[PDB]
Design a binder for these strands. Structure first.
Lengths: 100, 88, 129, 55, 271, 51
RNA sequence: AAGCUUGAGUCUCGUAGAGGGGGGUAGAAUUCCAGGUGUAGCGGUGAAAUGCGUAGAGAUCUGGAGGAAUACCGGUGGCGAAGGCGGCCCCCUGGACGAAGACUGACGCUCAGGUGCGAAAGCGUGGGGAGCAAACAGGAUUAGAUACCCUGGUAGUCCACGCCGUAAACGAUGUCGACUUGGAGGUUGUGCCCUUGAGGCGUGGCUUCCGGAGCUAACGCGUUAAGUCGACCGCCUGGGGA
RNA sequence: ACUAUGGUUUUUAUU
């Protein structure tokens, strides 16, 4: 298998319903026997410009182990649902302890 | 240049051992395996001319060894060309 | 790899004294050792030594005195592309008698003196002064 | 140093102009300065630092 | 792909051939045929109202489903075949329930592919869902301009329509004349771009080819009798006038839109 | 000069005394991309007669 | 004819790259549409017009369409055989370089003829066209304006592909092995000793300007030599005509 | 926002 980070920016005042929206498509990687190590918040951060009308993000980390011929099927599954921008996939070396 | 397994395979399955890398027939097989792995890269990339420049020299290194082997022993040369996919 | 072993021998000697080095080293050959023999036997070098069996290597110990430079001109004349030969009646003079000439003859590497005392001609090995 | 993803930490190393001081006039290590200027590149690509001073 | 022909004759020296090895060879599905009766350019009273047409082979029409819903029903491409009129071929679709129908094949002209319909399908060329369910920048072929209709836009080789703005029950999309139209979001299309994209690279060929295509020669208005075309008369080879149609209307600069009832859909046209 | 200093100034800047021709300032040191290097020299100072 | 093995070739585990190709992707903006707030000017000049407004421009906000290149970071700082390669991903890929081991056994090194690699302009075949822009139009400037000024705008700039073979391809250093001198400012692999030294001896690969020896008519080259010694291939013949 | 048009020829060398 191959490892990826896959981080979602997430609006802090919808951060209790956005992880369930990502889990509306996780069948696209658990169908390939992918293993998901958190799909969870890390901590609020501030931006130098607004993303989805807000200068802040809640940062929700997936941390996944999967085959290599399914990472383009997964990023195409988010091509039109308007939850993925600038990849944020960050391949290889896998997660650090508790993501620090 | 190829992965730890893509070579061995060849060096022990067509040769004798991974500590007998230098045998002439096995170096011609290691070049043939390297050429055929790149026949899965080129004609799928219809250009990539600056990387295709490597494949151009790999067939020249295979020509260097085949011609020198034909002058070194004609029976080993004639055996090799029906044990690899050579001279069509 | 090496296209002229004796051009490297002569460069290692000629420039070694200009680098003021005590000794210089190279892969050893019975041609290099025969050239080192006549250079010691006519008093231009101090010692030559070989070590090894499957990788034989030569070390030449350079000769020094009260003045400056013991070897002042060491010119090959004959090269593997274009060779130069000499005959008994015309065996060469070097720097009007300041130097001597070396030849391979039909017997081995020797002085023009030892050649004219056997009646031999042959290829030039070096002119030394 | 070792991280680029948290701005509450990264902001302690930069000026209020988004810059750093050259290594040989701060006594800092050679690759540490390259990795610091690269952490600033990665933090701009993560939208934690600006592309323009406008607005 | 498209290829040249041997220069061994006139016409053949310029004519282009369309080739594809992944078309099925066999017997066409006759329940989806309309033999298509000809008119020779004549009205219902036997009088000519359209010129330059008559003769050639019958060509006919291949029928597509004008009531295509099939929501939730998976299907497969059973056949990919030649059409005597459609430049972008025709595909036969076989539903899991339970008929054979003709559908307009998108880019890649693929056989043995599995395709869906309805609001749950994944966004792919040839996967059909309402324009209510698609984002801005999306590409569509076989587009209907009123909900539930048999389609009228983007059905020719290399054709498509793009959606550029959206609000509630209506989407705003662009047309090839510099127009931009407001259309109902309940329209479903067939999603993507029409395949082949090379049939516009063509030259007519030999003069007898127009006769098997059913295309008839022109007549110069200055050689016609002076009362049947305003350009007639003669004598001779002098025309001291500004050019007109056979009905005495100037050919240039006369803009003809006179509809008065469809302005409500316009977003880029001007009077 | 490209300065952002605002409020209490008059007479359209050029505020630094002896800034161009016969020194000050810089060009000591005009060649080889080192133009602003004497500012660094006289800040890393320390002594100027070094052995 | 047959050996030997340090140079050559390959293999384990590692170092750093805007090198190449395939399929994706931002920041922001000249332009353009539309809804707020708002009023008679915008742009250029020694003066001005053409153009864009007065029907609401320019302005500034809110939300979009559009094609296409990298600013801040960036440093002659990297890569490629070379004109060239730079915002950021995912997937394939040629080459350079090291530590310790294992095979081949002269395997090196240059190349007649040959077969190959494009920067820009231009072209063949389609697609596209936001800004810019040969040609060209609109107005001035001027003796003229053929140019500078200034608004538009086709060819082009761009893409998947195919031709062309050419340059200031200039780091003007043919290519390749060996032997070397001090500096500034950047960078990367590694062995060894209680670290008698809370620390130090030993060594491989690159990179951009200085400045020695040696080289030259003088400029300059300068360990990535135009230097010392050697191997192979190519080119020139006073000027103009040409 | 700056001006076309005024051709051509010259010396110290000896004691």
């Amino acid at each position: 298998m191959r490892h990826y980070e896959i981080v979602f920016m997430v609006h802090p005042d919808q951060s209790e319903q956005v992880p369930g929206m990502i889990e509306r498509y996780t069948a696209a990687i658990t169908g390939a026997e992918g293993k998901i190590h958190r799909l969870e918040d890390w901590g609020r951060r501030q931006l130098a410009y607004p993303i989805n009308k807000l200068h802040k993000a809640h940062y929700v980390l997936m941390n996944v182990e999967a085959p290599q011929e399914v990472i383009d099927e997964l990023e195409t599954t988010f091509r039109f649902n308007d939850a993925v921008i600038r990849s944020m996939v960050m391949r290889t070396k896998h997660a650090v302890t508790e993501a620090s | 240049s190829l992965s730890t397994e893509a070579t061995a395979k060849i060096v022990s399955e067509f040769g004798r051992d991974a500590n007998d890398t230098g045998s002439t027939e096995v170096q011609v097989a290691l070049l043939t395996a390297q050429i055929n792995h790149l026949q899965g890269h080129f004609a799928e990339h219809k250009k990539d001319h600056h990387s295709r420049r490597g494949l151009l020299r790999m067939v020249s290194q295979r020509r260097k060894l085949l011609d020198y082997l034909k002058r070194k022993d004609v029976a080993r040369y004639t055996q090799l060309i029906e044990r690899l996919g050579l001279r069509r | 790899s090496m296209q002229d072993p004796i051009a490297d021998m002569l460069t290692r000697i000629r420039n070694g004294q200009a680098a003021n080095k005590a000794a210089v080293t190279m892969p050893s050959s019975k041609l290099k050792v025969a050239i080192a023999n006549v250079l010691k036997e006519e008093g231009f070098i101090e010692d030559f030594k070989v070590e090894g069996d499957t990788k034989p290597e030569l070390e030449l110990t350079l000769k020094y005195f009260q003045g400056k430079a013991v070897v002042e001109s060491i010119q090959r004349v004959s090269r593997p592309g274009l060779r130069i030969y000499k005959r008994k009646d015309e065996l060469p003079k070097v720097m009007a008698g300041l130097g001597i000439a070396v030849v391979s003859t039909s017997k081995g590497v020797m002085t023009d003196r030892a050649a004219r005392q056997a009646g031999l001609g042959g290829e030039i090995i070096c002119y030394v002064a | 140093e070792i991280d680029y993803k948290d701005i509450a930490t990264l902001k302690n190393y930069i000026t209020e102009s988004g810059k750093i001081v050259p290594s040989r006039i701060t006594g800092t290590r050679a690759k540490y300065q390259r990795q610091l200027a690269r952490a600033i590149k990665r933090a701009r690509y993560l939208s934690l630092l600006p592309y323009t001073d406008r607005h | 792909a498209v290829v040249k022909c041997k220069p061994t004759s006139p016409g053949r020296r310029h004519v282009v051939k369309v080739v594809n090895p992944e078309l099925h060879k066999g017997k066409p599905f006759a329940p989806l045929l309309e033999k298509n009766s000809k008119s020779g350019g004549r009205n219902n009273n036997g009088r000519i109202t359209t010129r330059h047409i008559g003769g050639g082979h019958k060509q006919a029409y291949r029928i597509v489903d004008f009531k295509r819903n099939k929501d939730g029903i998976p299907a497969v491409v059973e056949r990919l075949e030649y059409d005597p009129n459609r430049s972008a071929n025709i595909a036969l679709v076989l539903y899991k329930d339970g008929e054979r129908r003709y559908i307009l094949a998108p880019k890649g002209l693929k056989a043995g592919d599995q395709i869906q319909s309805g609001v749950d399908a994944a966004i792919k060329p040839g996967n059909t869902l309402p324009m209510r369910n698609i984002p801005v920048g999306s590409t569509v072929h076989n587009v209907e301009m009123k909900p539930g209709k048999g389609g009228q836009l983007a059905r020719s080789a290399g054709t498509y329509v793009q959606i550029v703005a959206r609000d509630g029950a209506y989407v705003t999309l662009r047309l090839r004349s510099g127009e931009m139209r407001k259309v109902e979001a309940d329209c479903r299309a067939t999603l993507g771009e029409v395949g082949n994209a090379e049939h516009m690279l063509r030259v007519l060929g030999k003069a007898g080819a127009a006769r098997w295509r059913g295309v008839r020669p022109t007549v110069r208005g200055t050689a016609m009798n002076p009362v049947d075309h305003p350009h007639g008369g003669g004598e001779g080879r002098n025309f001291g006038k500004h050019p007109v149609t056979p009905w005495g209307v100037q050919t240039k600069g006369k803009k003809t839109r006179s509809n008065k009832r469809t302005d409500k859909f316009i977003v880029r046209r001007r009077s | 000069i490209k300065v952002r200093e605002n409020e209490p100034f008059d007479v359209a800047l050029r505020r630094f005394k002896r800034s161009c021709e016969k020194a000050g300032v810089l060009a000591e040191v005009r060649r080889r991309e080192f133009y602003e290097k004497p500012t660094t020299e006289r800040k890393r100072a320390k002594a100027s007669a070094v052995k």
